[PDB]
Amino acid sequence: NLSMQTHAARMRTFMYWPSSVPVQPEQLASAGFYYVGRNDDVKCFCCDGGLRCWESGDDPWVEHAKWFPRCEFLIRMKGQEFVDEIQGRY
């Protein structure tokens, strides 16, 4: 995942992303995720968190904060406040 530290490199992994998945590469790459080349499995370049089974309306940033709240990339991009709220702390 060192190769995956840039937005451009992440975007390139979605070459063979299945077109039927209802979440788009741009939103995934922007939230830190790259395609691992099987089904709809993606991983974060920073925290190595894996996500799959994307559904219509899923928001990669929200899912990042839901499952991997301590990710430093996530915190730097969205802030600890956003992460806390996703985690149900106000």
Ligand SMILES: CC[C@H](NC)C(=O)N[C@H](C(=O)N1C[C@@H]2Cc3ccccc3N2C[C@H]1C(=O)N[C@@H]1CCOc2ccccc21)C1CCCCC1
């Ligand atoms: C990504 C949005 C999606 N919306 C439905 C979603 O919530 N996906 C979950 C998801 O992607 N998860 C959830 C699991 C549960 C969990 C508990 C504690 C810490 C992390 C956790 N999750 C991570 C993630 C997941 O299953 N990742 C898998 C397992 C680890 O290995 C890989 C590697 C690549 C891609 C995915 C995963 C999903 C997994 C299977 C179907 C049910 C929910």
Ligand SMILES: [Zn+2]
């Ligand atoms: Zn992460």
